[PDB]
Amino acid sequence: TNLRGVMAALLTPFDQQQALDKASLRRLVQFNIQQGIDGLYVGGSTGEAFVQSLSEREQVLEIVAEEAKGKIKLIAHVGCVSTAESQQLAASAKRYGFDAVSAVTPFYYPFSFEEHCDHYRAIIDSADGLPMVVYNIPALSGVKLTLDQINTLVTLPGVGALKQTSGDLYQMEQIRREHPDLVLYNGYDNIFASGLLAGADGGIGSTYNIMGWRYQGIVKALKEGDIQTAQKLQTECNKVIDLLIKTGVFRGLKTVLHYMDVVSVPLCRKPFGPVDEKYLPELKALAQQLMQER
Amino acid sequence: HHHATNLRGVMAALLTPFDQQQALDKASLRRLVQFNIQQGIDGLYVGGSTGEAFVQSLSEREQVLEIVAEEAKGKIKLIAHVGCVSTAESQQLAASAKRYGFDAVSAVTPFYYPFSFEEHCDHYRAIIDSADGLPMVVYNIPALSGVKLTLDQINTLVTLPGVGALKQTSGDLYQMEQIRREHPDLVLYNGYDNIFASGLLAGADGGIGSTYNIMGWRYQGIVKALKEGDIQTAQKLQTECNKVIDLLIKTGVFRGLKTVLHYMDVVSVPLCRKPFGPVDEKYLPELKALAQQLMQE
Amino acid sequence: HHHATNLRGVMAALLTPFDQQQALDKASLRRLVQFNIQQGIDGLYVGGSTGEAFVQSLSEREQVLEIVAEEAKGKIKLIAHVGCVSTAESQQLAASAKRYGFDAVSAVTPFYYPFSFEEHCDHYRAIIDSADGLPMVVYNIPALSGVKLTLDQINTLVTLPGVGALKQTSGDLYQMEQIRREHPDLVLYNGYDNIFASGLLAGADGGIGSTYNIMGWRYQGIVKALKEGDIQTAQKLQTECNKVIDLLIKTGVFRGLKTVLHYMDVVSVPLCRKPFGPVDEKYLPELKALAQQLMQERG
Amino acid sequence: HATNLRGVMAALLTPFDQQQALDKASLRRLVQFNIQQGIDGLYVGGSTGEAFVQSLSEREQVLEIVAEEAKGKIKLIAHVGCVSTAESQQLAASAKRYGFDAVSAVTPFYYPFSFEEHCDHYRAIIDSADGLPMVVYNIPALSGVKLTLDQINTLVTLPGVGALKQTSGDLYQMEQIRREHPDLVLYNGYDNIFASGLLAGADGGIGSTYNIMGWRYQGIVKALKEGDIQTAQKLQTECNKVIDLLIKTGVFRGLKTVLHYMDVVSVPLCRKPFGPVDEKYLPELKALAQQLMQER
Ligand SMILES: [Cl-]
Ligand SMILES: [Cl-]
Ligand SMILES: [Cl-]
Ligand SMILES: [Cl-]
């Protein structure tokens, strides 16, 4: 119930030699707090966790909890393929003072659903009271959950939310219908208004980094019966999303954060390549415009 | 596309009644048309996927169009789905739909063979030509037709001279918004019934659906609620529609709908055409019960 | 399977010639049945996807079948593809196939609508009853049908009474082995012409193909070469098969095959039925150059 | 220059103990069991080796031991792939340090990178290999990448690349790659189509199931060479009787459980989240083991 809301998928700022840029991480953490964000989702896919070591991920959970613990909600994405490695991160989450833990369906190899459940159970054990945020992610990983299976995942003792990273809003409504109390995060930014309409009660997203007030603006708008306002705001979010998909989403976002003075050097880690120099005009212009809106 | 304004709304994908010898049941087709009209439906999409077009002849599909037009022309809006894999067979139907006085035509993207997009484009231009003044509704339905469109291609498609409308049989609500942003005036039908409210909010301004045959007023209710900023009524109606869709998925959709309409005394014989099988007997009390829920409501 | 042994072989999937009015070209059709029997081909697979069945009416399809029965009956094996979405339509074509003296019938898995496995099986059973003794070739093409059967579903399918062959248009040569393991006397046609050599080794005991029309003797050469334990020539014949398929893919497979026959002066008009478009102007040189190529090595 | 890498390369399993720790005794044992089956070389730290539930140090430790047990005696290829370029670069440098003959890397996964980004990945690793040939992947089914033919041609021609691991069941494309690159070291990666894949143009393979019946695959390689098509098909069928079971049981564990009953690996476990093999299949697996021992 306290995990309900709009939660930024925190990006990982890197210095010129691809190491963790501490000062930029803190500025980005604070930049997000200033936006009226309800929380931070730290070390997810978005934070480039799958190109960081366990110690590099752990250094972030630390530096972020130090910056923002108590001021806004904090969810530690601890997911790895290896259960054991995930269990270490869950244990470090419980130390640093996070409010919750999360884990992507373990990927790369074919694991049965029953292996998934035992994977989450072991991380719930190592989490030590922290609620778990489960994934329904039939895309990036490559698995295909049904609906009885989803009911089993979300009612595993110790599970307190679902990150529904799917554009299937029939499935969303079904979830909400079965679990009226469930904390239920809309995972895809470019359908957020429709996802809340179908059953979600918040979201986790990467683009919240640069326009989080617009998502909070949509929440308010639908809450107040202002449907034209919700649509107009979502259309503004998608205008930004069209661009970012063209430029590469994480690097496009870091670059917009560079023109906003928050992130010193906009780089993603290799094998991600640079933002194509031809998109710099549009991106600085977007930063300008988003700076004009506050 | 602002000249196609009067095609806006909730259109039932009319089923085609068959008798126990698998022949057209014309008495029940007329009953079904009229029942759809009593329900306050905005119009009818005739001979679609839903109306089992692909297991009927051109002559059979033509007989259906004529009987619907006879019953309902001038009363509610009428859309003839004339699409075949063949462009010429398609044209034969677009001409007849004109002859019967239909308000518009439609065509599924021709399927099975791997047609290039500009071949798709020539297929359609030719049907609009044969349609002799009637506006056209184009498609996606990748799920059944196996045709995957890019954004650029969908723009060209809906901006071809004579296109009044897009049936968007796609659950991708990001693309719905992108279509709406680029085309504020376009008529944009939500194809998937189980996301209707969400599709409207993403930018659709109506829908075509198979379940509107049995609870069209609920879908109409959702349109009104969203216009009047009433999300709680919208969500409620969508949940009740999805409770039924849930059931219809278990039973087989077309034949579940036909059985509910049989228990509603509209459709004499609830069969779909082979190779479709009959409703599993175990499901009939649920469907009867449902018919009795819906009729009382 | 036992009774279908006589349908083991290399069978050209016949194309359907059309004139300038999009109507059927009857003399070119007969020009092709003849051109095919002089390649040493074991038979003809008639009215299939390749014969453009799905943009013709029932009437048009029967007409094609009746003609082919005039020209071939007895000489080369004759398989009629009678498959439609509708079971009742498929049955009409099946009965007609029996009337005209075909050796076999076949139907693609019914498509567009998601039908159940049980619904597929009843579809075949009805069609077979209407063929009235003519064995059935179950036709399996996932890429275009959208119908995706399990192995168990395929084993049940190929053992329905009256089924004597599987047409396997799949590149999954694991499954091609598995079906042979389970059914050692099934007539098993390789359906992707570009893997014929590999498919034979995995377990196809023959094939059905669009490209056999123009170069069917090469596939007999593979069967022969593998028979002779001659890996070299078989690989050679397949690379040569694939060189043509490469271009046939670029141009458009059906119309390319038709055009090649148009420069072989077998087809008057190399067009396909709309929505199929004409070929790009720029490929005519290669198609014309290829038609010349194949006659030289043949006759 | 390429041809020395040509042949039948087992994708080596990584044995673990009851605590998931690397089992070095069982790895030594398994490396020797491979060599004496008659294998041409070993593919170390691949997907088959549970690379993606190991840390870099664990992967380096495995590579070092195999190179000690096998340097000079058979070809060794070190799979050095990770998502991260820099992590892959460390592993590649380590492989060079340990005396491997080649390195490999799976197309980087999870995030969608571009084909340009994949090639730059391959460049950075190749550089870090400092002279070791690179084995590239064409993988549509386990990584999500959807490479084209012209892209594969660009891949196989990058400076330093000396082989393609064709982990695709598309034998039209196999034929197509061999026709375009008649010298290329081309490994069949889908074990259950090996013979057919050789006929389309592969000149060797890399597979997990070579750990228990590698002699069958060299026996298929031999049978085709002489033009004994019959024995080639008999062997592929026996390989697929095995591959059917392993698919039921779980391929890596299935395979380890058989090596356990061959007294090769002590503890037949995969790392979590892989569970153990179902106890019902243990009768079948023991039998396969006894069978395969008695068969040589
Ligand atoms: Cl994330
Ligand atoms: Cl429809
Ligand atoms: Cl065919
Ligand atoms: Cl591997």
Residue numbers in the entry:
A (entry chain B): 3 to 296
B (entry chain D): -1 to 295
C (entry chain A): -1 to 297
D (entry chain C): 1 to 296
The authors write:
Sialic acids are essential components of complex carbohydrates that play pivotal roles as recognition signals in a variety of biological processes. The residue responsible for this alteration of specificity at position 192 lies at one end of the active-site cleft opposite the active-site catalytic residue Lys165, which forms a Schiff base with the substrate as part of the catalytic cycle. In order to probe the mechanism by which alteration of the residue at position 192 affects substrate specificity, we have undertaken an analysis of the activity of all 20 variants of NAL at position 192 along with an X-ray structural analysis of the E192N enzyme in the absence and in the presence of a competitive inhibitor, (2R,3R)-2,3,4-trihydroxy-N,N-dipropylbutanamide (THB).
We therefore identified new conditions for the crystallization of E. coli NAL (in space group P21) that avoided the use of sulfate ions and allowed us to solve the structures of both the wild type and the E192N variant in the presence and in the absence of a number of ligands. The crystal structures of wild-type E. coli NAL and the E192N variant were solved at 2.2 Å and 1.8 Å, respectively, and show a tertiary structure identical to that previously observed. The overall RMSD between the Cα atoms in the wild-type structure and the Cα atoms in the E192N structure is 0.3 Å. The only significant differences are the orientation of Asn192 compared to that of the wild-type Glu192 and the resulting changes in surface potential at the entrance of the catalytic pocket when the negatively charged glutamate is replaced.
